[PDB]
């Protein structure tokens, strides 16, 4: 038994997922006056949720079908609301901000999770937090803010961070009190989010517009489909890595994956970055790694 693939599969899958997301959301469809921007975040998130739910169903039906799910449906619905809210808010924010900024902001999960835990759950962090978390804040203030009001994009990113913190709190509570497996939770929350997003797109009137837009630029279809696939397989790998190595291994793996994704976005796509902004990303990632190691 060899486990390099715990690194290789997750890294490749999520790296390609990030590249496809950048190519889709920030792509320059059309030209000149005919140029159009991808404003259909709901449809993208709905497709991703559908693909993830299908893969989760396959995984549970083929892997470890003996387990019985003790969780309550309403808990799954409540978690899925925040989960899909976070995903939609982040994807919509990506329309305004660059991709490096989007990923860096979405990486700062520890700050909202600590705030939620201390303010609501009352858990105290002697050394796990309050140290290497101020490092993350310093890095963000170095990158997002510079010496030389905030727009819609960072507001939406902050909202996504808050929703992600709420989702994490709910998931932790349900895991503790109902012993829910990763595959079952992933399937259920993805199904609930798929239903909610289907209702939202159908009633909002965005499905017709998205279909017309795709008809205008058919290639995007392929892209988004691949994107969805890369969001599933990699996720599955992470699940395995959760049960094979442990949580710390998964955390460090995703941290290095995010760093390499930022590097790829900066270099391949010619996203403009400058000195004293690289320092912010370095500080953020160092703080995230130290927090993962301790606590």
């Amino acid at each position: 038994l060899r486990l390099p693939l715990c690194f290789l599969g997750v890294f490749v899958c999520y790296f390609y997922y990030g590249i496809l997301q950048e190519k889709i959301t920030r792509g320059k469809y059309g030209e000149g006056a005919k140029q159009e921007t991808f404003t259909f975040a709901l449809t993208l998130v709905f497709i991703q949720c559908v693909i993830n739910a299908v893969f989760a169903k396959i995984l549970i039906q083929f892997f470890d079908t003996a387990r019985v799910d003790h969780t309550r449906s309403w808990l799954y619905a409540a978690c899925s609301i925040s989960y899909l809210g976070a995903m939609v808010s982040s994807n919509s924010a990506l329309q305004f901000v660059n991709y490096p900024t989007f990923v860096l902001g979405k990486s700062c999960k520890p700050i909202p999770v600590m705030l939620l835990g201390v303010t609501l759950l009352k858990k105290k962090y002697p050394l796990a937090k309050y140290l290497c978390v101020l490092l993350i804040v310093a890095g963000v203030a170095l990158f997002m803010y510079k010496p030389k009001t905030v727009g819609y994009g960072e507001l939406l990113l902050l909202l996504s961070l808050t929703l992600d913190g709420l989702t994490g709190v709910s998931q932790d509570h349900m895991r503790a009190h109902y012993q829910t497996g990763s595959n079952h939770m992933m399937l259920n929350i993805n199904l609930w989010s798929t239903l909610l997003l289907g209702m939202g797109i159908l009633f909002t009137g965005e499905l017709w517009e998205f279909l017309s837009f795709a008809e205008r630029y058919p290639a995007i279809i392929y892209n988004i489909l691949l994107f969805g696939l890369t969001s599933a397989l990699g996720q599955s790998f992470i699940f395995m890595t959760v049960v094979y190595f442990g949580p710390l291994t998964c955390s460090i793996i995703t941290t290095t994956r995010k760093f390499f994704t930022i590097l790829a976005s900066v270099i391949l796509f010619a996203n403009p970055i400058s000195p004293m902004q690289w320092v912010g990303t370095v500080l953020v990632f160092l703080g995230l790694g130290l927090d993962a190691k301790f606590g």
Partner: single-chain antibody
Amino acid sequence: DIVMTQSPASLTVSLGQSVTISCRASENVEYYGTSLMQWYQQKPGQPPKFLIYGASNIESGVPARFSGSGSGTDFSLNIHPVEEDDIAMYFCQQSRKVPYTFGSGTKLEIKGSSGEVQLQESGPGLVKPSQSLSLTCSVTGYSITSDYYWNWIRQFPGNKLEWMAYIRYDGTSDYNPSLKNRISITRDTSKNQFFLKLNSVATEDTATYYCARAYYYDGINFDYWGQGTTLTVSS
């Protein structure tokens, strides 16, 4: 399956003393920081009474005297102001793995000596070996199609409990892997009953069979119990 061992077989204690009963599991019974342990109390000739879940959380209605502590593979139940009422056999149960297992039981004895759910079990008393048996548990005051687990458990002579199986209101059922090939659990919603059928009963099946209602929270907790029906297998 996890084997639960209760350290004190029988504790001779006086009134007012602080009594601690220790239970140990063959494997860690923690899951994301939650200890899946339950403590029940059984008075003589009565069904077990649910006391504690999660190893520290006192069930509503239980006196404040009782408390729980411990983690990992070692747990303890403490009663500081012991009274006459808390004289019984105490059982520790693990809900980490599907074949839920109870402790051997610790007996405590003193020196010098429509608004609720009703479960009723019925079935033959004396049965020849190799015959097929069918116990029926009828529920009144509640519907088996609402959110609760309905379990069949049996207690052998010597007070050794053994969870046989259960059926959820969704229709999903779980069985003890040891007995999975000998028992079958079914339900009839029209009459609001559920049945356990045993094939090829043997002399070792003699026991008191209870049907219980349980809810899952930090482990399965058999909060409501039936009166128990005796079954004797003899030639």
